[PDB]
């Protein structure tokens, strides 16, 4: 054992002799091929997403380059990994949300959306005909009673709620940073949250970004509609970090 293989356990989603699923792990590796890193932080009264916006060409309409998506007017998501797979999963999420509201008469909770997507991914995990998606979804939104919500789902079918998470290349390091900065116990405010996420990403890649190198999604209790920050307000958040 300890890395043993038998049959096609490295080609399709069947068990390795030590009970692993190699294709799933390979999907996790496929997430990093994008070369991007996303940070998600939950506040006392909000939830914030931030992601690198690598546009190496001026021949692109920046306006069309985004890993932030509106799933519902009050549910936002960030995708990390293979692009097309990400958009596919986004479409599926949107459909599941709309259908949810249509059948049940109320807005879908982030919890249940994430659980649904993960449940779907598990099928790819257990059936041989198709391969898992090389993407990772992080959802943010305000629930009716539980407050702000940050959830995340895997190509493995795992899903969970977090105070803070990250995805992509600088994942483990971002987790280390965030789990260090959570133990402090500070007034998790709107600006505190935004700054925390931005600085996490920045220090983890070390940049002091331009306002055109990242994108910031956000959702608040006072304003539950998922809002994508203009480059202007992003910069407004940037210059405030170079003061202390």
């Amino acid at each position: 054992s300890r890395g043993s293989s038998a049959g096609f356990d490295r080609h399709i989603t069947i068990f390795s002799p030590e009970g692993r699923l190699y294709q799933v792990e390979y999907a996790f590796k496929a997430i990093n091929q994008g070369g991007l890193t996303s940070v998600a932080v939950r506040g006392k009264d909000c939830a914030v997403i931030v992601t690198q916006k690598k546009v190496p060409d001026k021949l692109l309409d920046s306006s069309t380059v985004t890993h932030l998506f509106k799933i519902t007017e009050n549910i936002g998501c960030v995708m990390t990994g293979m692009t097309a797979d990400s958009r596919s999963q986004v479409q599926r999420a949107r459909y599941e949300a709309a259908n949810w509201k249509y059948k049940y008469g109320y807005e879908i909770p982030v919890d249940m959306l994430c659980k649904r997507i993960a449940d779907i991914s598990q099928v790819y995990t257990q059936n041989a005909e198709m391969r898992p998606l090389g993407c990772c979804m992080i959802l943010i939104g305000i629930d009716e009673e539980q407050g702000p919500q940050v959830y995340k789902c895997d190509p493995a079918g795992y899903y969970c709620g977090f105070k803070a998470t990250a995805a992509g290349v600088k994942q483990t390091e971002s987790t280390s940073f965030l789990e260090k900065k959570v133990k402090k116990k500070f007034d998790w405010t709107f600006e505190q949250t935004v700054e925390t996420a931005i600085t996490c990403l920045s220090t983890v890649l070390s940049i002091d970004f331009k306002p055109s190198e990242i994108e910031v999604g956000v959702v608040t209790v006072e304003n539950p509609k998922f809002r994508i920050l203009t480059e202007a307000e992003i910069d407004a958040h940037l210059v405030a970090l170079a003061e202390r």
Binding site: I12, K29, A30, L59, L60, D61, A84, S88, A128, G134
Partner: protein, 245 residues
């Protein structure tokens, strides 16, 4: 960047380093294809295609790599041709169905998203193979503006100001970045397109070729049309003369 031990026989299989090699190979089939470029300005979008002639027996305008997807939407392809045609049929049907269901001309970004999801659907299973082609969609409206999108075999769709696909991709792009298309008009652009094509063409390896040109903009009232023989030959002349420097 080259693992082939059974890990590259199906699109339902990841490589141990997290890659799908079938899609990469289809992309490679696109890379071996003649170059096609498209560029967006302030009053529309222009397409140019280097259509390699394999025989003098073929008629003028055979194997067109420029398509009318909708009356307001044009399509430029590169790669395995039959695949490109099939995708053109798909795009056409999507646009048609959109009109029948919603009453108006399909927005370009939406058509792009739809066809791209369709393309992505072929990169997941062993039962089918990825499309061996990349394509550009161009459109113009007064309510949306001029728009140009590009889609690759993986299913990725992006919006561009200028784009190119095929053999001389990067060279073409370098030639394109010299233009200030955000201020020029399609008229001025046609010449530059033809020019970049004639530059990027390799007369040594590839023999004779034919230039395809497509309008879509305010000059055409939103209708994607072929460039008139006049403007075409004008641009070609401008190109040939610009080639001697």
């Amino acid at each position: 960047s080259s693992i082939g031990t059974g890990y590259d026989l199906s699109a339902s299989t990841f490589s141990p380093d997290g890659r799908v090699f079938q899609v990469e190979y289809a992309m490679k089939a696109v890379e071996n294809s003649s170059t096609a470029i498209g560029i967006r300005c302030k009053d529309g979008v222009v397409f140019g295609v280097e259509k390699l002639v394999l025989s003098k027996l073929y008629e003028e305008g055979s194997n067109k790599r420029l398509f009318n997807v909708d009356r307001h939407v044009g399509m430029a392809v590169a790669g395995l041709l039959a695949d490109a045609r099939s995708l053109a049929d798909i795009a056409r049907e999507e646009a048609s169905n959109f009109r029948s269901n919603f009453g108006y001309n399909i927005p370009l970004k939406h058509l792009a998203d739809r066809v791209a999801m369709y393309v992505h659907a072929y990169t997941l299973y062993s039962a089918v193979r990825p499309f061996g082609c990349s394509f550009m969609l161009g459109s113009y409206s007064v309510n949306d503006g001029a728009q140009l999108y590009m889609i690759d075999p993986s299913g990725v769709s992006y919006g561009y100001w200028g784009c190119a696909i095929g053999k001389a991709r990067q060279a073409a792009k370098t030639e394109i970045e010299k233009l200030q298309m955000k201020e020029m008009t399609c008229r001025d652009i046609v010449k530059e397109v033809a020019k970049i094509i004639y530059i990027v063409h390799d007369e040594v390896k590839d023999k004779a070729f034919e230039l395809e040109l497509s309008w879509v903009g305010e000059l055409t009232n939103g209708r994607h049309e072929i460039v008139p023989k006049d403007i075409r030959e004008e641009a070609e002349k401008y190109a040939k003369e610009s080639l001697k420097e």
